[PDB]
Structures are given as structure tokens and as C-alpha cells.
Amino acid sequence: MLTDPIADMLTRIRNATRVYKESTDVPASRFKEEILRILAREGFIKGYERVDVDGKPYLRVYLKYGPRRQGPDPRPEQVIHHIRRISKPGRRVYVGVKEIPRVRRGLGIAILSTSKGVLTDREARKLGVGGELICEVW
Amino acid sequence: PTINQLVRKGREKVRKKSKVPALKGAPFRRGVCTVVRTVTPKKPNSALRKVAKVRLTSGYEVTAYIPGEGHNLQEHSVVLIRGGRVKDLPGVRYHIVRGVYDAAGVKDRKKSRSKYGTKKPKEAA
RNA sequence: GGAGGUAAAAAUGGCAAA
RNA sequence: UUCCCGGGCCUUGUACACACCGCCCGUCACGCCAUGGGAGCGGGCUCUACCCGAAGUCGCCGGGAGCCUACGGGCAGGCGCCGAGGGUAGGGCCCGUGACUGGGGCGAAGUCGUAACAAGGUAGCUGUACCGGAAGGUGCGGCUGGA
RNA sequence: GGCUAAUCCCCCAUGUGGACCCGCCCCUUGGGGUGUGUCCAAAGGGCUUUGCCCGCUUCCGGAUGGGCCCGCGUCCCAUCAGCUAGUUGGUGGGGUAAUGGCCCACCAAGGCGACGACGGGUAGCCGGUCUGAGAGGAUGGCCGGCCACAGGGGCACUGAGACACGGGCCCCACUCCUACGGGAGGCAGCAGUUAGGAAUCUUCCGCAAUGGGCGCAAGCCUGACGGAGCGACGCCGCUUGGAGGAAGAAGCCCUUCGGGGUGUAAACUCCUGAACCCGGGACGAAACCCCCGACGAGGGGACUGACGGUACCGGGGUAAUAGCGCCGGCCAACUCCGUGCCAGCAGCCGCGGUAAUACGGAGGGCGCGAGCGUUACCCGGAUUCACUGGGCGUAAAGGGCGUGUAGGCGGCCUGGGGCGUCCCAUGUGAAAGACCACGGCUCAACCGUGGGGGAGCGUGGGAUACGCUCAGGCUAGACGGUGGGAGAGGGUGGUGGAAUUCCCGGAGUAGCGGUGAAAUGCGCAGAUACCGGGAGGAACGCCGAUGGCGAAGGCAGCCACCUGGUCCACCCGUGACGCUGAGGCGCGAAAGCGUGGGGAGCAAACCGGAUUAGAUACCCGGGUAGUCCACGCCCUAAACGAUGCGCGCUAGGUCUCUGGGUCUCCUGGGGGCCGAAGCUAACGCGUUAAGCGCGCCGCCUGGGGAGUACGGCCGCAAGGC
Numbered sequence A: 001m002l003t004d005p006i007a008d009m010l011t012r013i014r015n016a017t018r019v020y021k022e023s024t025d026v027p028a029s030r031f032k033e034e035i036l037r038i039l040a041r042e043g044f045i046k047g048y049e050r051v052d053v054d055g056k057p058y059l060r061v062y063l064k065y066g067p068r069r070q071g072p073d074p075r076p077e078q079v080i081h082h083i084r085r086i087s088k089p090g091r092r093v094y095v096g097v098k099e100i101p102r103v104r105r106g107l108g109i110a111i112l113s114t115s116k117g118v119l120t121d122r123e124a125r126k127l128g129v130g131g132e133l134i135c136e137v138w
Numbered sequence B: 001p002t003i004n005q006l007v008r009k010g011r012e013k014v015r016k017k018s019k020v021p022a023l024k025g026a027p028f029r030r031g032v033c034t035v036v037r038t039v040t041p042k043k044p045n046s047a048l049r050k051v052a053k054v055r056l057t058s059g060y061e062v063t064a065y066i067p068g069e070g071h072n073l074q075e076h077s078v079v080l081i082r083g084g085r086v087k088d089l090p091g092v093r094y095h096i097v098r099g100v101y102d103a104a105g106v107k108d109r110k111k112s113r114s115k116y117g118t119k120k121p122k123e124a125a
Numbered sequence C: 001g002g003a004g005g006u007a008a009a010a011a012u013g014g015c016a017a018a
Numbered sequence D: 001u002u003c004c005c006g007g008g009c010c011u012u013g014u015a016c017a018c019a020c021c022g023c024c025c026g027u028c029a030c031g032c033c034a035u036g037g038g039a040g041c042g043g044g045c046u047c048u049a050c051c052c053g054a055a056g057u058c059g060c061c062g063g064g065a066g067c068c069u070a071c072g073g074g075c076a077g078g079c080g081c082c083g084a085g086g087g088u089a090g091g092g093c094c095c096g097u098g099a100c101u102g103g104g105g106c107g108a109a110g111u112c113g114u115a116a117c118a119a120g121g122u123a124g125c126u127g128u129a130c131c132g133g134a135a136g137g138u139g140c141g142g143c144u145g146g147a
Numbered sequence E: 001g002g003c004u005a006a007u008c009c010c011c012c013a014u015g016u017g018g019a020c021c022c023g024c025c026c027c028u029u030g031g032g033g034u035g036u037g038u039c040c041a042a043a044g045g046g047c048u049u050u051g052c053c054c055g056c057u058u059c060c061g062g063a064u065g066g067g068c069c070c071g072c073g074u075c076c077c078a079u080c081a082g083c084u085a086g087u088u089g090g091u092g093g094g095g096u097a098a099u100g101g102c103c104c105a106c107c108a109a110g111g112c113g114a115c116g117a118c119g120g121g122u123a124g125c126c127g128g129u130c131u132g133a134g135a136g137g138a139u140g141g142c143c144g145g146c147c148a149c150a151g152g153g154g155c156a157c158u159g160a161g162a163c164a165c166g167g168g169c170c171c172c173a174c175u176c177c178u179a180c181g182g183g184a185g186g187c188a189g190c191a192g193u194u195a196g197g198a199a200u201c202u203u204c205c206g207c208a209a210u211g212g213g214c215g216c217a218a219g220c221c222u223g224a225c226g227g228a229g230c231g232a233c234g235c236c237g238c239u240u241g242g243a244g245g246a247a248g249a250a251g252c253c254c255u256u257c258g259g260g261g262u263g264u265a266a267a268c269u270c271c272u273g274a275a276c277c278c279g280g281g282a283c284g285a286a287a288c289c290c291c292c293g294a295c296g297a298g299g300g301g302a303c304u305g306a307c308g309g310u311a312c313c314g315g316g317g318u319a320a321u322a323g324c325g326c327c328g329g330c331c332a333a334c335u336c337c338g339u340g341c342c343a344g345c346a347g348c349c350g351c352g353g354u355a356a357u358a359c360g361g362a363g364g365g366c367g368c369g370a371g372c373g374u375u376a377c378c379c380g381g382a383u384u385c386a387c388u389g390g391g392c393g394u395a396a397a398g399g400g401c402g403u404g405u406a407g408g409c410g411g412c413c414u415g416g417g418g419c420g421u422c423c424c425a426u427g428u429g430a431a432a433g434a435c436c437a438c439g440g441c442u443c444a445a446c447c448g449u450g451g452g453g454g455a456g457c458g459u460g461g462g463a464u465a466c467g468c469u470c471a472g473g474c475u476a477g478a479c480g481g482u483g484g485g486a487g488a489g490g491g492u493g494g495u496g497g498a499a500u501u502c503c504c505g506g507a508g509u510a511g512c513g514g515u516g517a518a519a520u521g522c523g524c525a526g527a528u529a530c531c532g533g534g535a536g537g538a539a540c541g542c543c544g545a546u547g548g549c550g551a552a553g554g555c556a557g558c559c560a561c562c563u564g565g566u567c568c569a570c571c572c573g574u575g576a577c578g579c580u581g582a583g584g585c586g587c588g589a590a591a592g593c594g595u596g597g598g599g600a601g602c603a604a605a606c607c608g609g610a611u612u613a614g615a616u617a618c619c620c621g622g623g624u625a626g627u628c629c630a631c632g633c634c635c636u637a638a639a640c641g642a643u644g645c646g647c648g649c650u651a652g653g654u655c656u657c658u659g660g661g662u663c664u665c666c667u668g669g670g671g672g673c674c675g676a677a678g679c680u681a682a683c684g685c686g687u688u689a690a691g692c693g694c695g696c697c698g699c700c701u702g703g704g705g706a707g708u709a710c711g712g713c714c715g716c717a718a719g720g721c
């Protein structure tokens, strides 16, 4: 039924990084398209493209991972150590420019939808707007 | 639970119960003794602990423990309830302050005489 | 050869403790 | 080598671990305490209906009867509604008490059995029904927390 | 009864002006203006006096204080689920400064409630205070703001304002004075008495200051206040000396007796100097008053201190109170003696029964110091109510299962609004406290000054990504069509055979049943075992499975009728119609209950026979309800996968059921096993998650007491929730 199409996207990404898959398919949405624009510039993915699956538009989000570590357990480190939805439909989380969190002491990213568009924590304090705290990625 | 379940139901406060029903939780309470005697403790131990039924001002009648070694408590003795129970005596939850109105302090006490109510002896020192 | 599937016997151990 | 006793290894079951000379369940006897029921009794608060009802505001009279400084007016006075409360009658909740009674909790070493844990010697537990001093047994269906 | 004065009361006038009715105009709830009619005013006093001052009257305006109303927030109990007669609304009045059922008559029958009305318990609320990393939790003592009260209860009067603490009236309770008939009083003001209690002060001094009231002023009043007094009650500051001092006295403790500890502690020697004594001595005080100027601005002069001769300054000058808790682990600090599950300790675990670092004492040690401990309470630790920040297969916990009300949540695209949300500006957010700097008391506590900001809410403006809404559209969700498929899905009606038991006939005999060994029992009245025939009920062997179906409970000979769910293909229609679901509603094994029928086998209770110390049981022989049918009840469970439902994602291998295909093989649904990643405390789960997510619901919060008692609902009861 997809109560939240945003968390299904972030979970499809999270489920594709634990098996080290080349890419994954998420359905199409112009709002999810703007969320993925932020994941590409900050360096969590390779990008996406408006593909078409059986006449239904999806999004081939190309993943990216770290260097192949040696020794025991040779799987590489994730570029996305953590990703989760905050403003869930059961509890909408709304914040302002003073109450923006320091996601992993600035080493993380805080995507949040503003009236100026889908921006992030460092772009929200520069323009001075704030808004719906979407998610935290690090 | 869910957020909506917490807006509807909420969180129940624990609201702890008192272990000392001294009627308004006063620090002390004057009472007269009715029956002073000796009882037997629980299964791991075995002795003759001195206890006392005290008719307090609040109208109830509770058992009270006599601390120390030796006392001067009778059927018409006025004592002061302190608090705190005795682990080995089921039914004893209060303590008797020694050194007040009828209960004299522990005779020949020397070390912890703040408790058991004994004054400072003066032997030229 | 795979299910089904073989009892006649019998009570108890004072308390607390490295 | 079936069977008594002791021992070795593997496996299984365990609520046992000062370890089966283990543990453990219920009834009964004694003691302490708390609680429910209980012929009822006592008290607080509150409600409904009625009887009476001061002060006082307001409403009417103000005359066969007073006072008045400007009198188709005022005051005194009288009447009525309301009214604190008092009284009567029935209720509602709560608290305290009561001969006696039901089960409960607790208190080292009392009596009776052996239900459970090892196929615990009747695999156990469970819902219901019946019975039995008691743990408990049996019936019907269920469960694997058993083979 | 009688005089008598005023800033007392009244009448006439004047009317700037104001009030009211009516009309008109602007505005637009009763605001403002205007015209006619009417109504309303008023006080004098003192002096350097026909000139000012203090007052009076009317109206408008300011400033302050208050009344009423509204939005939002404000404890627990649902074992309180219905409440409502001035109750809800209208019309007209009464009343008030003023709206209003505030009150009164009439009419309409409404108003409130699971978003918790009504009722019951409790509580004054806040700024703040305490804690806490924070969020929150707890609190409302001093100070400040608002309220409510003044022995309990009602009521009005005066007045700008009171339903009036030290004003009035009345009723009650109580105390007191009485010539007995009718009077006095209200410390929850300041002290003080008594009572209760674990517990809480001086019947002190002063109006010098600040503030209030009156008065032109002088000044009077102020238990407001300023101070003093008591109390280690809290915090802060300080003292009981300081420097020397023996390889180290005495006493005491331990000792492997050789010595170690108290212990540089003491004595002793220098040095400083609390307390004390003497002299001096305040800041808080400058106005009001007077003089010059006009009793204005400005300038000048004088009076006045409770605390108090007090803090303080200067001189002199004495070695000058130490106590309490603890020493098993947590938790810092160890030896001797006594005692012997005794006496005793104790916050938790726990010590003690002859050698106790845990009792008691001593020595020594640790910790704090005019304090130290204890008891009670609040937060913390407690992330054990988890919003930050918890959980439910087996530890506490998924409702027995469905359907479904409200509610919560909801797919893709593009527009409109901008309610949530976000930004900026403005207003508020009193002071105090808190926080940061600098000051004042010789520091600090205390206090002054300045600065800094929250959030919340009102107003103006902007933004439109997400949520909401309106409108258009789309098909992946969901539903429907067409064609087929399997199945113990459910109800009704009929029907087949095997077997058990009983009756009848034939035949036939000395035993049959039964145990794990025997009896009870049955049988020469002709049993068991065999043949033939009949009745009657219940269950359906083989197929059958580790199988199928249903949401669960559960469902099995066969036939037929009625009927439900589901699956696959074709991708045709509707077009977001969805998911979950408190309450409700219905179903719900067995046992049980009622009413009637039926009753072969089995079989609670019951009776025998054995076993046994005993047997109310296990085993044997009988056997009644029940089992079975029809209707109505009951509503439980190990109702179990001890895993609620829905959707998306994440390796595979293998067995099996059921469709479809260009059917080697692929793909949809379902039932099993093993296992990537991952999870978990472990067992184990693992596309049929206990994984990664999201929506909604139920539930959990240590064990016993207890699924008990009371209350409520349901039931015929048993009993259930």
C-alpha cells in the first residue's frame, strides 16, 4: 500500500547496500527525484536515471561502496553507514533554523524539505529557512 | 507502542507506595507501649529480639524494635518512633529512639552513642 | 519394511550454614 | 549378561548442584497479622420532597391609626415572594465497628500422605464436569512446554 | 421637649456644558455630530487683602486602578457513562457603572457528554524553587503578582470603590458581665497564653530613615516598616595558635618478644595574639522648615538617629572549646580481647553455633568539622512508563477468530488557496531570582549596576518543497468482467457396507472372559466359539500423506440440492474507491445447562474383584448422566506457529499440493525442510523472518496474594468479562 514512499526508497537503498548490489529500483516520484539529487552531490551514490519498467517509471539508483578491505570479512565499508526516516507519517517532525541538529558533528547530512525546496542542514542555515526534517544519512 | 496509542492512552506514572504509614510521614511520633516482649526471627537466624507494641497518637497500634543491649521499657512507657524495619522480624517496621522520655540510653555504651542515645562520659580526658 | 510402538512391583530422608 | 550390587564410555531427560541419602506439593495442629462476607450498630458528606422561618433587599398597601420642613410626597408601620438555618420523611456514596465465618500471607527442626521434577515409577500440563482427608484421581476434547 | 452654626440639607435662577425621547447625517452592536422639547449645577475658608492661595460646581481629555467577556493551557479515579427546570434559546421587562437565565413572566424543546459530561478524592494558581546531560519529574515555604477568605452561615447599608478582619444587622456554637431584663466579645494583625504535636521565637525599641492616611503648614497616627532579641534551622566567614622538638619520654595497644604503633604528637623553648581593658567614634540625613528671589526656577542657612557608643579606628593585652559518624564487600579505613545462632548488628547481599577485620570494648585508621549522624519526603541513579529513550516465539506481555463504526494513516502528475509548517519586522513576555561581567560591605554569603536571550501568543508581510484542502487527470494499489481449476469449507435431504451389542432358529459342548499373575463376572436354566435371520444406534477401514480446505474453532463412506472463500489465465471495465480498526456485532473445541427425542459401543459419579501399610487411584468385571439428533443457552482452553493484520525490499538449494505457458524448463498461489546477509540473551528465525522499513490495533512494567475480593454487566445455573 506504501504508506510512506520515501522510507520505502531509503529502505530499498539500505537493503541494497548490505548485499553489495550494483543498483536498485525504486518507483518514480519528482519529490524522490529531488531527494536523490542531494544523495548524489554529497557522495552517497553514483546517480540515477528515469528508467521505465513495463511501462511504469522507476529510478535506477546506482550505489557506491568503499575499498575492499583485507584480512577477515573482506566486504568493503559502506559509504552509507546509517540511513533512516525521521519525519514519519505517524509523527511529523518540524524544525527551525535554531533547532537544526548536528548530525554526527557535521560529518553526517540532514536532509530537510524547506519552502525554498529540498535542501540540507548546511544549506538551510545559509539561506535561513528550516522545515520538515526528512532524514539523516551518515 | 505507537505514537497515536500514546496520545490516546499515554504513560502511567509509577506513584510509589509508602513503607512507613506514620500518618503524614512525620519523622517521629510519640507513643505509649502496651505489650513489650521478645520474639523469634526468620529461618536463617535464631535469637530473642526485643519488640514492643506501641499505641501511638495516631490511634493505631504497631510493633516497635528496641535497639541496643538492655532497656527500661514497661507497660506504661512513653517512647518515640523513628522508622526503618528489621529484616529478620516480619511485622516489625519501626524503631524506638533511645534516650527520649522513658527509654534510657544503652548503659555502658562507648562507641556509637549518637545512636542508642548515650551521653559523653567524662573520665578526665 | 514403513507405520503402529514394549513396566507388574515399593513410601520416605529433621533445621540452618565454606 | 535377562535379573541384584559396583564401575567405564557415548547419548537423552532434569524443577537435582552441601547433587536421589536431592528436591518438592497439599490438607491438618499452633502463633501473629491483614482482608472479604456477616444479624446489624455508630459517624461523616450529599441529594429529593415538604413544614416553619430571623435579618435584609425588592414588590403592594400606607387605610377605621401616627410623624413630617414647601403634602396627588416622604418616614414609621403592615403584607407578600425570596431567604440563613431548624424540623420531619425516604435515599445515595464513603469510613469505623460486630458474635461468627470463608479463604490468604507469614512464622528454623509438629502430624498425614507422595501429586510434580528422571517413562518420577499412571508422560505431564490444560479447559470443563463429577468425586475424594489431602496433595489429587477419573471422564470428554485439546497441547508439546513428551516418547 | 426646646434652641442653634456651617463645606449639612433643600428651592428658585444662570447655563459654557451634559443627560434623556424623537427626527436627520457620518459611522456602522449602545461611537460621533446636530435641531426642537424637558431636566440638572454649585461653598466657602486664610492671610504680607477688593490681590493671591486652599477648596467648590459642571463638562471634555490624560494618568492610574478595577469590572465583565473570549481563545488556548491547568491532578487522580471509567471499580463514576450518562447528565440537565432556570435546564438550553427567543420576546419583553427588572437590576447593575456595564453584557448576561444575573433575576422574573410567556413561548419554542432544547443544551452538554468517550475530544470523558455528571459525580467522587485532592489542591489556592503563577513568576519561581529543587533536581536533571537534556527532555522531563517533583514542588508553590521566604519574596513578588492575581484570587479566595476574617469564629460558622446569610444579608444589606454608607460610599468613587466593600457585601467590608480591628463597620452594621440576624441565626448558631462558645466565653464573659449581670440588679435576670438584656448586654459585651470574635488575635487566619504585632508580640504573648493554652491545646494539639517530633517541632517552630520577644507580651523588645523607635517613627531617625523609606512608604501610607489626614492637614496650607506646623505636626499627629502607623506592631507598615526600619532595627534589636531568641533558636547551630540553613548558608557564609572565623577561632581553639605558629615555628622549633629525641633514631624519638611516660602511659596505652600489638608482638614471630628482637621490636613496631600512637608519634614531631606531648613536655619544653621562642614568636604572634581570640577573648578581654581604655580612649575616640560614625555612613545611613537631606528634604519638609526658614531667608533672597513672587511661599516657582535657582542659591544659602538651620533642625532631626531607634539601632548605639553599636559595627569600626587607635593603644594595651591572655596559649586560649572538640566533637560526631564509620572501618566485611558496595565504600576510604585492621589488629587484640570478650561473647559463643547467646547477647547483639543490619540500607542491599547478609554476619554470630569457641580462635568474628560484620556483635561489645580497647588500640590504631579513614571521612567531615561547630558540626556529625539518623528518620521522613522530592528528583536522580531508574533507558524499571523509554517524546528524546524500552518492549511482547520460549523471561511480564499479540486480543480465540472475523466483519465493521468512529478515529489514525494513505499511490503518481499538474494547477488554486496558504490551515499545519518556515522566515523577517513589531508588541507582549512586570520586577525579583537564575546566567555573564564590574562594583559595595576588610572577603564570602548578601546586595547594587549593566548586558544577554528563551519558547508561548497577538498583528503586518513573504515563501509553497512536504502534510491539509479544492479542481482536473493517470494507472502499478484495490475492486469488477470473461473463461476455467482444485478442495474433509458450510447447511439440508436421502443413502451403502464392515463391525460391536441384543433378540430368535439350527448346530454343539465343560468351560468362557480377563491380568503383567488371578478373582469378581458369565455358563449345563445350554454360555465361549460357528451358521442363518432381524432390530437399533454410532463412527466411516483401505484411498490417507511429512496431503487438502476454512479467518479461527474446526471439517473425512456416497449421492444430490442450496452456498461461501480462493486460485490462474485473458489483460477488457471502474478508477484511489485503500490499510488498520477502540466500541459494537457474529462465529467459537470439549465439557456443561434447559426442553423433547434417541441410546449399540464407550464411559465421569457409583458398586464390586484384586494390588496395597492404606486405594476414595493406576489394572479387571458391571454401570448412570454424558457422548449422538432438533432448537435455545454457555464464551472457556496449551482457542499454540505460546509469533495480530496489511504492503514494499533483501542469496539460494531441495521435497510436495494446485493452475497456466511457445509446457527440457519458466512463472503465479499454497504446505514442509536446510540455509547468504541480517537479527537474537541463547536455543533458533531466515521471501510462510523472530531481517530491513512504514501504517494501525491489542497487550507488558518483579514474584506471591489473584484472575481472588468488592462494585458493574452478562447467564437458568455452573460461571464468564
Ligand SMILES: NC[C@@H]1O[C@H](O[C@H]2[C@@H](O)[C@H](O[C@@H]3[C@@H](O)[C@H](N)C[C@H](N)[C@H]3O[C@H]3O[C@H](CO)[C@@H](O)[C@H](O)[C@H]3N)O[C@@H]2CO)[C@H](N)[C@@H](O)[C@@H]1O
Binding pocket: D107
Ligand atoms: N507458603 C505458601 C503457602 O504455604 C502453605 O503451607 C503452610 C503450611 O502448610 C506449612 O506448614 C508447614 C508444614 O507443611 C510442614 N509439614 C511442617 C512445617 N513445620 C510447617 O511449617 C510451618 O509451621 C511452623 C510452626 O509449626 C512455622 O515455624 C513455619 O514457619 C511454618 N512454615 O507452612 C506454610 C506456611 O508457612 C501451603 N504450602 C500453601 O497453601 C501455600 O504455598
Ligand SMILES: [Mg+2]
Binding pocket: C012
Ligand atoms: Mg512422612
Ligand SMILES: [Mg+2]
Binding pocket: C012
Ligand atoms: Mg525419595
Ligand SMILES: [Mg+2]
Binding pocket: C013
Ligand atoms: Mg532434608
Ligand SMILES: [Mg+2]
Binding pocket: B043, B044, B045, B046, C016, E341
Ligand atoms: Mg542459622
Ligand SMILES: [Mg+2]
Binding pocket: D009
Ligand atoms: Mg574408555
Ligand SMILES: [Mg+2]
Binding pocket: none
Ligand atoms: Mg546419563
Ligand SMILES: [Mg+2]
Binding pocket: none
Ligand atoms: Mg469486615
Ligand SMILES: [Mg+2]
Binding pocket: D072
Ligand atoms: Mg400627585
Ligand SMILES: [Mg+2]
Binding pocket: none
Ligand atoms: Mg459493615
Ligand SMILES: [Mg+2]
Binding pocket: none
Ligand atoms: Mg476474619
Ligand SMILES: [Mg+2]
Binding pocket: D114, D115, D120
Ligand atoms: Mg509420584
Ligand SMILES: [Mg+2]
Binding pocket: D122
Ligand atoms: Mg506420574
Ligand SMILES: [Mg+2]
Binding pocket: none
Ligand atoms: Mg500424575
Ligand SMILES: [Mg+2]
Binding pocket: none
Ligand atoms: Mg481435566
Ligand SMILES: [Mg+2]
Binding pocket: D137, D138
Ligand atoms: Mg475416581
